[PDB]
Amino acid sequence: MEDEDVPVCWICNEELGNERFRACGCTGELENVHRSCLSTWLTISRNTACQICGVVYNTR
Ligand SMILES: [Zn+2]
Ligand SMILES: [Zn+2]
């Protein structure tokens, strides 16, 4: 039960607790990120997949 604690979106630095958004499978903050600012961020920064592990954001 180590999943406890609330993760924070590495983009806007805000706790999400469990925003269901498969955008990457890293081992740090990236593992948890709001699909709101991430999906839109990569769109503004022009990105389709995490440049840390090579996983696509896959946003709705
Ligand atoms: Zn990643
Ligand atoms: Zn966020």
UniProtKB/Swiss-Prot annotation:
Described function: Membrane-bound E3 ubiquitin ligase expressed during late stages of lytic replication to mediate polyubiquitination of various host membrane proteins related to the immune response. Promotes ubiquitination and subsequent degradation of host MHC-I and CD1D molecules, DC-SIGN and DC-SIGNR, presumably to prevent lysis of infected cells by cytotoxic T-lymphocytes. Binds target molecules through transmembrane interaction. E3 ubiquitin-protein ligases accept ubiquitin from specific E2 ubiquitin-conjugating enzymes, and then transfer it to target protein.
Binding site for Zn(2+) 1: 9, 12, 34, 37
Disulphide-bonded residues: none
Cytoplasmic compartment spans: 1-60
Subunit-structure text: Binds human MHC-I and CD1D.
Localization per Swiss-Prot or TrEMBL: Host cell membrane; Host endoplasmic reticulum
Residue numbers binding Zn(2+) 2: 24, 26, 50, 53
Miscellaneous remark of the record: Specific for HLA-A, HLA-B, HLA-C and HLA-E alleles.
Zinc finger (RING-CH-type): 1-60
Protein name per Swiss-Prot or TrEMBL: E3 ubiquitin-protein ligase MIR1
